[PDB]
């Protein structure tokens, strides 16, 4: 369907990515 929230989830994931990347960037 043509929704806008799915397009916005990209920004929501960017926040989760920052922490997810920091965990691997700092350890492992």
SS3 28: coil
What the block records as the tokens of 27 is 């350890």
Phi-psi sector, 3: left (phi>0), alpha (psi -120 to 50), beta: beta
Domain containing 13 equals 1-28
- Report how this structure was experimentally obtained: NMR
Among residues 9, 28, 27, the alpha carbon closest in space to that of 17 is found at 9
Among residues 24, 2, 22, the alpha carbon closest in space to that of 14 is found at 22
What's the chain's Rg over C-alpha atoms?
A: 13
Provide the domain count of the chain: 1
């Amino acid at each position: 369907s043509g929704n806008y929230v799915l397009d916005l989830i990209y920004s929501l994931h960017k926040q989760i990515n920052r922490g997810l990347k920091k965990i691997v960037l700092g350890w492992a």
